[PDB]
């Protein structure tokens, strides 16, 4: 029924190699790593908690 | 060398009591899961046992090992009063725990409303106040002092400090501390055992395909065997002076002391308590 048509429509989509996507995600994570206060310990004065 | 073994035994008993009560209190206070309305009585009993094992047990051991008591008269009176307060508080707290279990089992629907954190703290405060009233007040004002010639020089002398008591205070202290809680505990445990037997019979009848007796036996017999002889000789030596000697009195009193160390071992037996002990240690 409509499920077959929906699956056929979903199958026809552009695909980007997993290597490129993984490299882009890793690059974003490395570039924005310093902004995260969880990875780098928060200074006591700057920490809103305690 | 004979007293060396007695000193070692006393030190071991004091250390065991202190360590057990400290561990029980730390487990009860550190983890919020163990914090419960019914656990407040348990931690009160643990605090009383810790206080007794810290104050009365070491000073009593020092008095036993060395005959001379080097501290002042006022300090020895304070030590005796602390001993009485701790013993009375421990027995009253055991009675209150038994009463709480009886209310929880016999009256399950009304137990939730009857018992609350404020109610539990009020009960604990009343227990400690009534323990202090029967310990601090009659001892500091010298109401328990004897009238006969003996022990008057002991009261005057700094070295001698022994538990010599008139007729009135012994019976009243026994009734306030042990005898009434004994009767209350026996009644509220017989009722609970009857309820447990009824429930087991119902289970057996409903489904074709013991522990209560052993648990009640442990809980009642440990306390009774540890404390009843001491209070019975407390009544006796006033009823008949020549019957009771000093050594029997001291050994029975120390058995009552070590009951405090035995108490958390048989009371803090819940699986949650075991998990807390494993995590802490």
């Amino acid at each position: 029924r409509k499920l077959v048509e929906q699956l056929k429509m979903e199958a026809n989509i552009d695909r980007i190699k997993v290597s490129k996507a993984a490299a882009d995600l890793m690059a974003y994570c490395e570039a924005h790593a310093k902004e995260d206060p969880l990875l780098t310990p928060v200074p006591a004065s700057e920490n809103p908690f305690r | 060398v004979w007293v060396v073994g007695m000193g070692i035994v006393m030190s071991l008993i004091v250390l065991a009591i202190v360590f057990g009560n400290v561990l029980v209190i730390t487990a009860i206070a550190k983890f919020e899961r163990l914090q419960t309305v019914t656990n407040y009585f348990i931690t009160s009993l643990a605090c009383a046992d810790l206080v007794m094992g810290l104050a009365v047990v070491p000073f009593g051991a020092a008095h036993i090992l060395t005959k001379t008591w080097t501290f002042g008269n006022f300090w020895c009176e304070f030590w005796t009063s602390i001993d009485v307060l701790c013993v009375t508080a421990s027995i009253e707290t055991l009675c209150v725990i038994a009463v709480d279990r009886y209310f929880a089992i016999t009256s399950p629907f009304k137990y939730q409303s009857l018992l609350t954190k404020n109610k539990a703290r009020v009960i604990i405060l009343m227990v400690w106040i009534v323990s202090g009233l029967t310990s601090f007040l009659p001892i500091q004002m010298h109401w328990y002092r004897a009238t006969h010639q003996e022990a008057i020089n002991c009261y005057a002398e700094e070295t001698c400090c022994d538990f010599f008591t008139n007729q009135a205070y012994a019976i009243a202290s026994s009734i306030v501390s042990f005898y009434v809680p004994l009767v209350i505990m026996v009644f509220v445990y017989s009722r609970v055992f009857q309820e447990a037997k009824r429930q087991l019979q119902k289970i057996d009848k409903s489904e074709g395909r013991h522990k209560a007796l052993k648990t009640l036996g442990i809980i009642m017999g440990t306390f009774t065997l540890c404390w009843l002889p001491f209070f019975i000789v407390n009544i006796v030596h006033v009823i008949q002076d020549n019957l009771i000697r000093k050594e029997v009195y001291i050994l029975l009193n120390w058995i009552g002391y070590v009951n405090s160390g035995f108490n958390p071992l048989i009371y803090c037996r819940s699986p949650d308590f075991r998990i807390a002990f494993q995590e802490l240690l």
Partner: protein
């Protein structure tokens, strides 16, 4: 009919396999490990009467909203650990809650069909329900806000719906899940979202189009939690199965899986950090876990709660991770 569907599924599987050149672990094998991280609670919250199942951080890094089975949805200030609002609920059973991006509205789900939206900022400081969303024909599981007017809900009727607050009727209905949908997470651009059902299939929806663009059904057991990567091109799915998997939108396939031998329990909530390096995941066991996204290696464990952790939350500023559990007490971790 079935033959064509089977052939199309085989073709899409072959295309996904062909698009798989190098795995994420192979590429990031030379990256520096995050290392052990010491996360300890700074302020522990309390006040609830029963088990909470969900919570949501505010747009500001201060306020919280949490709902429990006592029937009370109470708003908290995480900086001072003092309650701001206490909103009683018509239904004693709830399954989710949400916080408006502007902060003026709070919406909660429930085991009943009805979804309720409450007014926070009103005259004289009175809390009241603005609208009662109806007609979803199933127990609701999640709620998120696109804006102050649009809300997307997920229920047990295997359908996700997009509602309009003013009209009170769902604008668009999403269908395609064999099992019931449990969790969803919006995109930073508020134009895409994904949903994890009970059939292990996590599908991606387009709010404007109303049709599932992609479908990721690479999991084994039912999905209990889901959340976007901060970039918006990836998302991680929690499940009753111990494994936690990170999918991809541009690659259309799974990249990494997070499984350990010791953990045999389920997963209830998953949330990334601000940078996405750390993947926090609550577990059916009393402890949660922290995973290195680019290395699939655990970098910590937090066993603060005494019951099963049901909800996770990371602030928009990324300051602290707040985790609740079936124990009434909440804990803010930093």
């Amino acid at each position: 009919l079935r033959q064509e569907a089977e052939q199309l599924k085989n073709q899409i599987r072959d295309a996904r396999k062909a698009c798989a050149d190098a795995t994420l672990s192979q590429i990031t094998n030379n990256i520096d490990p995050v290392g052990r991280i010491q996360m300890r609670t700074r302020r522990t919250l309390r006040g609830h009467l029963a088990k909470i199942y969900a919570m949501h951080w505010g747009t500001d890094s201060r306020l919280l909203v949490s709902a429990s089975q006592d029937g009370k949805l109470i708003i908290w200030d995480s900086y001072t650990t003092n309650k701001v609002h206490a909103i009683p609920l018509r239904s004693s059973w709830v399954m989710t809650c949400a916080y408006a991006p502007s902060g003026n509205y709070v919406a909660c789900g429930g085991l009943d069909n009805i979804c309720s939206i409450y007014n926070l900022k009103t005259r004289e400081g009175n809390v009241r329900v603005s609208r009662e969303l109806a007609g979803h024909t199933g127990y609701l599981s999640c709620c998120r806000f696109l804006d102050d007017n649009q809300i997307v809900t997920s229920s047990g009727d295997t359908t996700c719906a997009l509602w309009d607050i003013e009209t009170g009727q769902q604008t668009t209905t999403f269908t395609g899940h064999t099992g019931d949908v449990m969790s969803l997470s919006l995109a930073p651009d508020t134009r895409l979202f994904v949903s994890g059902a009970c059939d292990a299939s996590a599908k991606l929806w387009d709010v404007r189009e109303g049709m599932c663009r992609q479908t990721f059904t690479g999991h084994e057991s039912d999905i209990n939690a889901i959340c976007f990567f901060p970039n918006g091109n990836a998302f991680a799915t929690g499940s009753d199965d111990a494994t936690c998997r990170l999918f991809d939108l541009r690659a259309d396939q799974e990249l990494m899986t997070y499984s350990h031998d010791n953990i045999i329990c389920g997963i209830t909530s998953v949330s990334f950090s601000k940078s996405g390096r750390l993947l926090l995941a609550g577990y059916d066991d009393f402890n949660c876990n922290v995973w290195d996204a680019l290395k699939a290696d655990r970098a910590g464990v937090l066993a603060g709660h005494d019951n099963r952790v049901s909800c996770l939350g990371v602030t928009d500023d990324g300051m602290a991770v707040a985790t609740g559990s079936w124990d009434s007490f909440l804990k803010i971790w930093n």
